[PDB]
C-alpha cells in the first residue's frame, strides 16, 4: 500500500467479467425560461438532481424557472469491470490466491474474455469506501486499479 498513484504492471487471470453499461458523467439541464443550459459534473457513486434553476438571468428576479434534464445532450462513457485472480505460480507455499478490482473505461472495453492470461498496466487509485459501520477505524481506504493498456499472452 505504498504504490498508490504510481504506474504499474500486473498480470493474472480474468475472472467474473461484468457487462458493459453506460456510465453517466455530466448531465444537461434545460431552463425553458432563461434558455440556458446547466451542467452538473458527478464524480461520486450516487448524486441528486438539483434545484429549479441556477442561471444568472433567472437569478436577481422574482420568478425563477423550473428545469428538467435531457438525454441526448449529456455525455456518457463505456463502463465495465472485472476481477483478476493471482497467477498461481509465485504464490507462497501455503496461501490461497486473492483478487483485485479493475475498472475499465472507454475504447478498451469489450476486449477482455474471461479466463485468460493478460498483462494489465495502469495507475493505482483508491475509492472512498469502508466496510461495516462499527469496524471503521476512521480513515479506511478501499483501492482499485484503472486499466490503461491490454497486452495478452496467447
Amino acid at each position: 500500500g505504498d504504490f498508490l498513484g504510481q504506474l504499474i504492471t500486473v498480470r493474472g487471470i480474468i475472472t467474473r467479467v461484468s457487462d458493459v453499461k453506460p456510465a453517466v458523467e455530466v448531465i444537461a439541464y434545460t431552463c425553458d425560461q432563461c434558455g440556458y443550459e446547466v451542467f452538473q459534473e458527478v464524480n461520486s457513486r450516487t448524486f441528486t438532481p438539483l434545484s429549479e434553476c441556477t442561471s444568472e438571468e433567472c437569478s436577481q428576479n422574482q420568478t425563477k424557472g423550473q428545469l428538467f434534464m435531457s438525454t441526448r445532450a449529456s455525455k456518457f462513457s463505456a463502463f465495465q469491470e472485472c476481477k483478476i485472480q493471482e497467477l498461481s505460480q509465485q504464490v507462497p507455499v501455503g496461501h490461497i490466491p486473492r483478487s483485485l478490482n479493475i475498472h475499465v473505461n472507454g475504447t478498451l472495453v469489450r476486449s477482455l474474455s474471461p479466463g485468460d492470461i493478460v498483462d494489465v498496466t495502469g495507475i493505482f487509485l483508491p475509492a472512498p469506501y469502508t466496510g461495516f459501520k462499527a469496524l471503521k477505524a476512521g480513515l479506511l481506504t478501499e483501492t482499485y486499479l484503472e486499466a490503461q493498456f491490454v497486452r495478452q499472452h496467447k
Partner: protein, 596 residues
C-alpha cells in the same frame, strides 16, 4: 517543552541503553545494510523496517522499578524509551518501534479467562488464527494543489488507535476552497499511506476444555506487521490490552476492547505450520562437516530411526530418502518432472505398523495425519464462504492443500472410498488440484509426499494364496506407489530372542541433532547426474523388463523415473555435488528387496 518526568524516563533508559552495547551493533547493522541496500539500487541501475528486539531479561537486573512500571501501566514508559531510542538512531548517524520479547509467568494467561481483569496492561496471548480480514491501506497526509497561486499545501489526519494516550480528538473536514476561492485540486502519490489489518484470535483447542462455546477477542496490526499469518495456525501475540470507546454513557453495554502495540510470533504445532526456525551455529556445521567425511554414515542413520523397533533395515533406508525428496527440474516451457517418492507398506497386524507412523510425523516437518475417511475437503477446499462483507466465494485450504512441501500420513488406506481416490490420481501425478464449482473454477499447487498403509483383505494370508490380489486395489494405484513393502509373520526362536531382550530393556547420534542435519541439506545439496550414472542403469533396466515380467508385474517407464530419484536422494545424504556409480549400486539393491 517536556516536564521533568518525561526526561527522567529517558535518561534512566538512556543509562540502560548505554549499559549494554549489544543493541548498539544491532541498529548499526540495520543502518549500514539499508544504506548498502539503497547503494546497489542507485549505482548500477543508471525493505527492512525499524524495530529491534529487546528481551525482558535485563530490566529486572537493572531497574526493578522500571520493570514494575511497564508490567502494570505501559502507557507511560513506552513513548519516552522510543523517543530515547530514536535519539540513538539519530545520534549514531520514523517510528523505530520495539519488540518486548521475553517470557514471564505474570500475564501469560488464556484469552478465555482474560476479560474484565488486567485491563490497560501488557498481556501475552497465544491461540488460533481464524477468519483473516482484508488488507486495506490508511489515509494519513493529504496533498492539494491550488491552480492560480501554483503552490501545494499540507494536511494530516490522526486516529485514536496509534497514539496510545487519550488525547483531545480534533476532527478536520477534508479540505475544499481554502483561503480566497481557488479550487483545491487534489493530487496523489506524494500523499502518504500506511496499510492496516484487523484479525480475530481463537484460543488453543489443546488447552480448551472438553466441550464449551469458545470465546475470542480481536487484534489490529500495524504497518510492517500486516499479513504474517494465514487463518489456521498457532501464533503467540504480545501486546497491550486497551479498551477504547465511550461506554454507553453518552445518551446496553459499551467498552468493547482490543489489543494494540503488538508483536507476532508464529509457533510450531504438532501438525500445522513451519518448524524450520532451528538455528545452525558454526559449531553445529563443523560437526556436520566432521560427520560427512565418513564412509558408512548411511548405515548409522538407518539404524538410528528404529529406537524401539527391532528389524526392518531396508524399510528405514527409504524413510531417509523421502525426506530428502529428490531433485526437481521444471522444464523450459514444458511441464515439471516430479521428484518426491511415495511408499505404501503392508503386513500382518501388531508388527510395528502403527509403531512407525507418528515417528514419521514427529521427526519430519509439516506433516498432517489423515485418518479414515477424507471426505469433502481433505483434497479440496469446498469454497463454502457466505461472507457478510460482500457476496463472493473464497477458499478454506484443505489438508492436501495445506501439506505442500511436506508429508501426508494416510492411515487405514483400504477403508477409503473410491470418491477421494479420483483426486489421488490428480494429486500424486500432476501435483496440482483444480476445483471447478459454479462459483469460480480454480487451479492450485500441491506437491506433497504420501505414505499410506492398507491391510490384507482377509486374515494374515500374506504369502499363502498368491502374491497378486492380497489387496484388490485399482490398477493405476499400483503404478502410483513406488515401493510396496511386505512384512511377514516369521515365527522363530532366535528371532524371538531378539524380540525378547529388546522389549525387556525397553521399559527400564540423537533425534534433535538429526533434523539439523536434514534441513541443512535442502538448500545447498542438490546434485547433478554424470556419465557414470547412465551405463549401469541402462544395462540394469533391460533386466527389469526382460526377467521380472517372468516373475511379477508391472514394469512401466515410470519405474525408471523412480530409479533416478533413488540415486538422487542418496547423493543428498553424502552431500556430494556429482553423482557416483555407488549411488546406483545402492539404488539397484533397493528394488530387489522391495519386490523379490
Amino acid at each position: 517543552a517536556p516536564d521533568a518526568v518525561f526526561g527522567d524516563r529517558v535518561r534512566r533508559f538512556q543509562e540502560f541503553l548505554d549499559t549494554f552495547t549489544s543493541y548498539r551493533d544491532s541498529v548499526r547493522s540495520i543502518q549500514v545494510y539499508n544504506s548498502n541496500n539503497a547503494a546497489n539500487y542507485n549505482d548500477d541501475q543508471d525493505i527492512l523496517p525499524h524495530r529491534i528486539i529487546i528481551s525482558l531479561d535485563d530490566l529486572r537486573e537493572f531497574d526493578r522499578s522500571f520493570w514494575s512500571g511497564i508490567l502494570v501501566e505501559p502507557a507511560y514508559f513506552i513513548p519516552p524509551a522510543e523517543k530515547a531510542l530514536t535519539d540513538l538512531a539519530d545520534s549514531m548517524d520514523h517510528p523505530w518501534k520495539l519488540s518486548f520479547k521475553g517470557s514471564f509467568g505474570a500475564h501469560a494467561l488464556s484469552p478465555r479467562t482474560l476479560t474484565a481483569q488486567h485491563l490497560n496492561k501488557l498481556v501475552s496471548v497465544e491461540g488460533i488464527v481464524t477468519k483473516t480480514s482484508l488488507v486495506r491501506p490508511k489515509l494519513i497526509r493529504s496533498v492539494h494543489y491550488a491552480a492560480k497561486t501554483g503552490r501545494f499545501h499540507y494536511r494530516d489526519y490522526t486516529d485514536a488507535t496509534t497514539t496510545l494516550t487519550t488525547r483531545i480528538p480534533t476532527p478536520a473536514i477534508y479540505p475544499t476552497e481554502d483561503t480566497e476561492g481557488n479550487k483545491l485540486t487534489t493530487e496523489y502519490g506524494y500523499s502518504t499511506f500506511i496499510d492496516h489489518q484487523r484479525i480475530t484470535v481463537q484460543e488453543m483447542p489443546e488447552m480448551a476444555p472438553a466441550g464449551q462455546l469458545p470465546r475470542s477477542i480481536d487484534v489490529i496490526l500495524d504497518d510492517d506487521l500486516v499479513d504474517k499469518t494465514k487463518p489456521g495456525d498457532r501464533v503467540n501475540v504480545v501486546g497491550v490490552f486497551k479498551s477504547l470507546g465511550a461506554g454507553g454513557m453518552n445518551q446496553l453495554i459499551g467498552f468493547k476492547t482490543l489489543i494494540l502495540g503488538n508483536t507476532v510470533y508464529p509457533l510450531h504445532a504438532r501438525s500445522t505450520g513451519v518448524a524450520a526456525r532451528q538455528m545452525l551455529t558454526d559449531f553445529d556445521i563443523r560437526n556436520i562437516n566432521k560427520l560427512s567425511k565418513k564412509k558408512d554414515i548411511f548405515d548409522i542413520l538407518s539404524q538410528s530411526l528404529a529406537p524401539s523397533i527391532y528389524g526392518h533395515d531396508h524399510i528405514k533406508k527409504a524413510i531417509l530418502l523421502m525426506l530428502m525428496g529428490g531433485v526437481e527440474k521444471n522444464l523450459e516451457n514444458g511441464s515439471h518432472l516430479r521428484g518426491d517418492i511415495n511408499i505404501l507398506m503392508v503386513g500382518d497386524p501388531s508388527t510395528a505398523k502403527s509403531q512407525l507412523l507418528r515417528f514419521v510425523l514427529n521427526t519430519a516437518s509439516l506433516a498432517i495425519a489423515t485418518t479414515g475417511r477424507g471426505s469433502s475437503g481433505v483434497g479440496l477446499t469446498a469454497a463454502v464462504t457466505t461472507d457478510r462483507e460482500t457476496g463472493e466465494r473464497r477458499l478454506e485450504a484443505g489438508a492436501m492443500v495445506l501439506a505442500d512441501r511436506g508429508v501426508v500420513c494416510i492411515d487405514e488406506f483400504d477403508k477409503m472410498t473410491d470418491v477421494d481416490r479420483v483426486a489421488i490420481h490428480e494429486v500424486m501425478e500432476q501435483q496440482t488440484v483444480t476445483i471447478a464449482k459454479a462459483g469460480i473454477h480454480t487451479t492450485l499447487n500441491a506437491r506433497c509426499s504420501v505414505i499410506a498403509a492398507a491391510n490384507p483383505v482377509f486374515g494374515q494370508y500374506d504369502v499363502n494364496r498368491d502374491p497378486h490380489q492380497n489387496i484388490a486395489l485399482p490398477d493405476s494405484l499400483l503404478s502410483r506407489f513406488d515401493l510396496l513393502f511386505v512384512v511377514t509373520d516369521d515365527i522363530n526362536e532366535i528371532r524371538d530372542r531378539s524380540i525378547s531382550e529388546h522389549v525387556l530393556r525397553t521399559h527400564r547420534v540423537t533425534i534433535p541433532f538429526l533434523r539439523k542435519y536434514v534441513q541443512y541439506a535442502k538448500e545447498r545439496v542438490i546434485p547433478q547426474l554424470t556419465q557414470e550414472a547412465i551405463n549401469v542403469i541402462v544395462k540394469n533396466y533391460t533386466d527389469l523388463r526382460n526377467d521380472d515380467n517372468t516373475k511379477k508385474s508391472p514394469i512401466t517407464a515410470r519405474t525408471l523415473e523412480t530409479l533416478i530419484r533413488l540415486a538422487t536422494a542418496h547423493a543428498k545424504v553424502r552431500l556430494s555435488k556429482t553423482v557416483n556409480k555407488v549411488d546406483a549400486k545402492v539404488a539397484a539393491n533397493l528394488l530387489r528387496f522391495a519386490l523379490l
